[PDB]
PDB file of C-alpha atoms and ligand atoms in Angstrom:
ATOM      1  CA  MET A   1     102.726  97.534 110.211  1.00  0.00           C
ATOM      2  CA  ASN A   2     103.231  96.121 106.728  1.00  0.00           C
ATOM      3  CA  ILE A   3     101.339  94.661 103.840  1.00  0.00           C
ATOM      4  CA  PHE A   4     101.154  91.197 105.249  1.00  0.00           C
ATOM      5  CA  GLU A   5      99.813  92.416 108.599  1.00  0.00           C
ATOM      6  CA  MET A   6      97.539  94.765 106.822  1.00  0.00           C
ATOM      7  CA  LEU A   7      95.928  92.182 104.612  1.00  0.00           C
ATOM      8  CA  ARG A   8      95.802  89.656 107.404  1.00  0.00           C
ATOM      9  CA  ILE A   9      93.592  92.174 109.242  1.00  0.00           C
ATOM     10  CA  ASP A  10      91.403  92.779 106.173  1.00  0.00           C
ATOM     11  CA  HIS A  11      90.887  89.062 105.291  1.00  0.00           C
ATOM     12  CA  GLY A  12      91.314  87.046 108.474  1.00  0.00           C
ATOM     13  CA  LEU A  13      92.607  83.507 108.501  1.00  0.00           C
ATOM     14  CA  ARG A  14      90.314  80.520 107.726  1.00  0.00           C
ATOM     15  CA  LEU A  15      91.512  76.921 107.595  1.00  0.00           C
ATOM     16  CA  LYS A  16      88.363  75.417 105.893  1.00  0.00           C
ATOM     17  CA  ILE A  17      86.767  76.454 102.711  1.00  0.00           C
ATOM     18  CA  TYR A  18      84.337  79.257 103.168  1.00  0.00           C
ATOM     19  CA  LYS A  19      82.366  81.679 101.079  1.00  0.00           C
ATOM     20  CA  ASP A  20      83.561  85.231 100.927  1.00  0.00           C
ATOM     21  CA  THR A  21      81.297  88.261 100.874  1.00  0.00           C
ATOM     22  CA  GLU A  22      80.454  87.702  97.131  1.00  0.00           C
ATOM     23  CA  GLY A  23      79.540  84.064  97.813  1.00  0.00           C
ATOM     24  CA  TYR A  24      82.782  82.635  96.342  1.00  0.00           C
ATOM     25  CA  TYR A  25      84.797  79.819  97.694  1.00  0.00           C
ATOM     26  CA  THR A  26      87.895  80.964  99.459  1.00  0.00           C
ATOM     27  CA  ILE A  27      90.326  79.698 102.048  1.00  0.00           C
ATOM     28  CA  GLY A  28      93.314  80.861 104.056  1.00  0.00           C
ATOM     29  CA  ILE A  29      93.993  84.607 103.945  1.00  0.00           C
ATOM     30  CA  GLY A  30      91.749  85.759 101.207  1.00  0.00           C
ATOM     31  CA  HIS A  31      92.772  83.033  98.751  1.00  0.00           C
ATOM     32  CA  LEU A  32      90.016  82.823  96.147  1.00  0.00           C
ATOM     33  CA  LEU A  33      89.641  79.306  94.935  1.00  0.00           C
ATOM     34  CA  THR A  34      86.905  79.638  92.379  1.00  0.00           C
ATOM     35  CA  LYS A  35      84.023  81.707  91.235  1.00  0.00           C
ATOM     36  CA  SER A  36      82.087  78.603  90.521  1.00  0.00           C
ATOM     37  CA  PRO A  37      79.232  77.446  92.720  1.00  0.00           C
ATOM     38  CA  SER A  38      80.555  73.882  93.018  1.00  0.00           C
ATOM     39  CA  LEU A  39      82.084  72.864  96.239  1.00  0.00           C
ATOM     40  CA  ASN A  40      83.698  70.154  94.299  1.00  0.00           C
ATOM     41  CA  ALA A  41      85.215  72.486  91.877  1.00  0.00           C
ATOM     42  CA  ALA A  42      86.501  74.368  94.927  1.00  0.00           C
ATOM     43  CA  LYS A  43      87.879  71.248  96.459  1.00  0.00           C
ATOM     44  CA  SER A  44      89.629  70.335  93.272  1.00  0.00           C
ATOM     45  CA  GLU A  45      91.150  73.753  92.994  1.00  0.00           C
ATOM     46  CA  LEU A  46      92.388  73.581  96.534  1.00  0.00           C
ATOM     47  CA  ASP A  47      94.101  70.211  96.177  1.00  0.00           C
ATOM     48  CA  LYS A  48      95.751  71.395  92.997  1.00  0.00           C
ATOM     49  CA  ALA A  49      96.919  74.539  94.794  1.00  0.00           C
ATOM     50  CA  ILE A  50      98.255  72.639  97.775  1.00  0.00           C
ATOM     51  CA  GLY A  51      99.480  69.654  95.934  1.00  0.00           C
ATOM     52  CA  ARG A  52      97.645  67.153  98.067  1.00  0.00           C
ATOM     53  CA  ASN A  53      94.267  65.684  98.737  1.00  0.00           C
ATOM     54  CA  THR A  54      93.090  68.178 101.385  1.00  0.00           C
ATOM     55  CA  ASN A  55      89.474  67.446 101.910  1.00  0.00           C
ATOM     56  CA  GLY A  56      88.847  71.221 102.088  1.00  0.00           C
ATOM     57  CA  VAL A  57      91.077  71.732 105.135  1.00  0.00           C
ATOM     58  CA  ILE A  58      94.652  73.097 105.224  1.00  0.00           C
ATOM     59  CA  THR A  59      97.194  73.838 107.765  1.00  0.00           C
ATOM     60  CA  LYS A  60      98.315  77.234 108.931  1.00  0.00           C
ATOM     61  CA  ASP A  61     101.634  76.784 107.239  1.00  0.00           C
ATOM     62  CA  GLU A  62      99.842  75.981 103.972  1.00  0.00           C
ATOM     63  CA  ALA A  63      97.643  79.052 104.314  1.00  0.00           C
ATOM     64  CA  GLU A  64     100.716  81.182 104.758  1.00  0.00           C
ATOM     65  CA  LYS A  65     102.381  79.665 101.742  1.00  0.00           C
ATOM     66  CA  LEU A  66      99.435  80.683  99.569  1.00  0.00           C
ATOM     67  CA  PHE A  67      99.436  84.074 101.265  1.00  0.00           C
ATOM     68  CA  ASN A  68     103.060  84.708 100.323  1.00  0.00           C
ATOM     69  CA  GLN A  69     102.517  83.567  96.765  1.00  0.00           C
ATOM     70  CA  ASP A  70      99.468  85.810  96.501  1.00  0.00           C
ATOM     71  CA  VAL A  71     101.134  88.921  97.815  1.00  0.00           C
ATOM     72  CA  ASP A  72     104.029  88.285  95.507  1.00  0.00           C
ATOM     73  CA  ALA A  73     101.668  87.860  92.574  1.00  0.00           C
ATOM     74  CA  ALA A  74      99.878  91.149  93.361  1.00  0.00           C
ATOM     75  CA  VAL A  75     103.157  93.082  93.437  1.00  0.00           C
ATOM     76  CA  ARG A  76     104.243  91.603  90.093  1.00  0.00           C
ATOM     77  CA  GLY A  77     100.856  92.227  88.487  1.00  0.00           C
ATOM     78  CA  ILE A  78     101.143  95.883  89.445  1.00  0.00           C
ATOM     79  CA  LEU A  79     104.731  96.145  88.120  1.00  0.00           C
ATOM     80  CA  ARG A  80     103.730  94.523  84.913  1.00  0.00           C
ATOM     81  CA  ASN A  81     100.601  96.638  84.454  1.00  0.00           C
ATOM     82  CA  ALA A  82     101.078  99.698  82.269  1.00  0.00           C
ATOM     83  CA  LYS A  83      98.318 101.595  84.016  1.00  0.00           C
ATOM     84  CA  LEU A  84      99.375 100.613  87.539  1.00  0.00           C
ATOM     85  CA  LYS A  85     103.099 100.755  87.470  1.00  0.00           C
ATOM     86  CA  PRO A  86     103.494 104.477  87.141  1.00  0.00           C
ATOM     87  CA  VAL A  87     101.048 105.087  89.918  1.00  0.00           C
ATOM     88  CA  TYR A  88     102.816 102.741  92.198  1.00  0.00           C
ATOM     89  CA  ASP A  89     106.172 104.146  91.264  1.00  0.00           C
ATOM     90  CA  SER A  90     105.006 107.568  92.275  1.00  0.00           C
ATOM     91  CA  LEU A  91     103.736 106.678  95.730  1.00  0.00           C
ATOM     92  CA  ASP A  92     105.397 106.589  99.153  1.00  0.00           C
ATOM     93  CA  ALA A  93     105.738 103.262 101.087  1.00  0.00           C
ATOM     94  CA  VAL A  94     102.428 103.339 102.959  1.00  0.00           C
ATOM     95  CA  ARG A  95     100.308 104.275  99.983  1.00  0.00           C
ATOM     96  CA  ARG A  96     102.009 101.616  97.871  1.00  0.00           C
ATOM     97  CA  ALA A  97     100.732  99.122 100.461  1.00  0.00           C
ATOM     98  CA  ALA A  98      97.218 100.567  99.979  1.00  0.00           C
ATOM     99  CA  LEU A  99      97.472  99.969  96.169  1.00  0.00           C
ATOM    100  CA  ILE A 100      98.672  96.363  96.684  1.00  0.00           C
ATOM    101  CA  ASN A 101      95.671  95.790  98.998  1.00  0.00           C
ATOM    102  CA  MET A 102      93.169  96.790  96.410  1.00  0.00           C
ATOM    103  CA  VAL A 103      94.918  94.680  93.810  1.00  0.00           C
ATOM    104  CA  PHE A 104      94.929  91.686  96.074  1.00  0.00           C
ATOM    105  CA  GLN A 105      91.258  92.227  96.670  1.00  0.00           C
ATOM    106  CA  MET A 106      90.010  92.807  93.224  1.00  0.00           C
ATOM    107  CA  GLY A 107      92.667  92.021  90.737  1.00  0.00           C
ATOM    108  CA  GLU A 108      94.804  94.147  88.514  1.00  0.00           C
ATOM    109  CA  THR A 109      92.059  94.482  86.095  1.00  0.00           C
ATOM    110  CA  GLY A 110      89.515  95.723  88.611  1.00  0.00           C
ATOM    111  CA  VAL A 111      91.962  98.223  89.936  1.00  0.00           C
ATOM    112  CA  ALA A 112      93.299  99.457  86.591  1.00  0.00           C
ATOM    113  CA  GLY A 113      89.656 100.474  85.958  1.00  0.00           C
ATOM    114  CA  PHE A 114      89.635 103.266  88.594  1.00  0.00           C
ATOM    115  CA  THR A 115      91.120 105.509  86.010  1.00  0.00           C
ATOM    116  CA  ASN A 116      90.061 108.728  87.585  1.00  0.00           C
ATOM    117  CA  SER A 117      91.221 107.933  91.113  1.00  0.00           C
ATOM    118  CA  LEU A 118      94.528 106.619  89.727  1.00  0.00           C
ATOM    119  CA  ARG A 119      95.105 109.939  88.053  1.00  0.00           C
ATOM    120  CA  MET A 120      94.362 111.784  91.290  1.00  0.00           C
ATOM    121  CA  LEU A 121      96.642 109.551  93.262  1.00  0.00           C
ATOM    122  CA  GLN A 122      99.371 110.132  90.771  1.00  0.00           C
ATOM    123  CA  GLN A 123      98.839 113.850  91.131  1.00  0.00           C
ATOM    124  CA  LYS A 124      98.948 113.631  94.931  1.00  0.00           C
ATOM    125  CA  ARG A 125      95.421 115.068  95.309  1.00  0.00           C
ATOM    126  CA  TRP A 126      94.644 112.880  98.327  1.00  0.00           C
ATOM    127  CA  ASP A 127      91.315 114.177  99.468  1.00  0.00           C
ATOM    128  CA  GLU A 128      89.952 114.233  96.010  1.00  0.00           C
ATOM    129  CA  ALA A 129      91.048 110.709  95.220  1.00  0.00           C
ATOM    130  CA  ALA A 130      89.491 109.588  98.526  1.00  0.00           C
ATOM    131  CA  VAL A 131      86.176 111.032  97.543  1.00  0.00           C
ATOM    132  CA  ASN A 132      86.396 109.436  94.087  1.00  0.00           C
ATOM    133  CA  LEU A 133      87.390 106.069  95.452  1.00  0.00           C
ATOM    134  CA  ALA A 134      84.248 106.072  97.595  1.00  0.00           C
ATOM    135  CA  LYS A 135      81.989 106.318  94.543  1.00  0.00           C
ATOM    136  CA  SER A 136      82.253 102.692  93.771  1.00  0.00           C
ATOM    137  CA  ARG A 137      80.590  99.423  94.153  1.00  0.00           C
ATOM    138  CA  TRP A 138      83.703  98.397  96.068  1.00  0.00           C
ATOM    139  CA  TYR A 139      83.021 100.976  98.741  1.00  0.00           C
ATOM    140  CA  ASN A 140      79.250 100.224  98.859  1.00  0.00           C
ATOM    141  CA  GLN A 141      79.723  96.419  99.155  1.00  0.00           C
ATOM    142  CA  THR A 142      82.524  96.433 101.769  1.00  0.00           C
ATOM    143  CA  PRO A 143      82.466  99.877 103.294  1.00  0.00           C
ATOM    144  CA  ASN A 144      84.568  99.135 106.387  1.00  0.00           C
ATOM    145  CA  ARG A 145      87.415  97.608 104.481  1.00  0.00           C
ATOM    146  CA  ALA A 146      87.133 100.269 101.794  1.00  0.00           C
ATOM    147  CA  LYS A 147      87.341 102.985 104.442  1.00  0.00           C
ATOM    148  CA  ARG A 148      90.552 101.609 105.870  1.00  0.00           C
ATOM    149  CA  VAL A 149      92.245 101.565 102.512  1.00  0.00           C
ATOM    150  CA  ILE A 150      90.899 104.906 101.475  1.00  0.00           C
ATOM    151  CA  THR A 151      92.073 106.492 104.773  1.00  0.00           C
ATOM    152  CA  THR A 152      95.484 104.992 104.126  1.00  0.00           C
ATOM    153  CA  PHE A 153      95.612 106.764 100.756  1.00  0.00           C
ATOM    154  CA  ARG A 154      94.337 110.008 102.198  1.00  0.00           C
ATOM    155  CA  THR A 155      96.748 110.188 105.064  1.00  0.00           C
ATOM    156  CA  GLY A 156      99.757 108.173 104.022  1.00  0.00           C
ATOM    157  CA  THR A 157      99.788 106.626 107.595  1.00  0.00           C
ATOM    158  CA  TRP A 158      98.648 103.348 109.205  1.00  0.00           C
ATOM    159  CA  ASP A 159      96.137 104.944 111.555  1.00  0.00           C
ATOM    160  CA  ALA A 160      93.151 103.064 110.172  1.00  0.00           C
ATOM    161  CA  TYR A 161      94.855  99.850 111.104  1.00  0.00           C
ATOM    162  CA  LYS A 162      96.133 100.683 114.515  1.00  0.00           C
ATOM    163  CA  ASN A 163      93.788  99.115 117.108  1.00  0.00           C
ATOM    164  CA  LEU A 164      92.728  96.082 114.959  1.00  0.00           C
TER     165      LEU A 164
HETATM  166 CL1  LIG B 201      97.636  78.749  93.532  1.00  0.00          CL
HETATM  167 CL1  LIG B 202      83.660  95.742 104.998  1.00  0.00          CL
END
């Protein structure tokens, strides 16, 4: 299992614009287009992202291209973030994938805000961080996804993803 497979499970693959769980226009594998309520705005962002007049539909290859760029961006945001970097640097390979997941999902900024859990993760207090992570809007809004990631941090294994 790896980050790509992991996030592909968490986000699915959609070839036409759709609204995510927060009501925002997205496409591909979790690629947020815009927070704005305008389908046009969304369409404009997509064409600009793809480099062609798409008409709100993309190919699988195109979706994957955005997916690679996005994963890459998440890794670099972490590495560039003064609050994130040290946490990431202290984790094993599986847990690093759990940190990338959250960043992909809610941005560096959102993640850097879980100050307390970050501290626990850094200290390797797994069960305690797991409990703390759960006390969040994130967990309450998308509990199933949140549980997979949280279990990943608790255990340091891919068990939550095997079966999916
Ligand atoms: Cl883009
Ligand atoms: Cl969920």
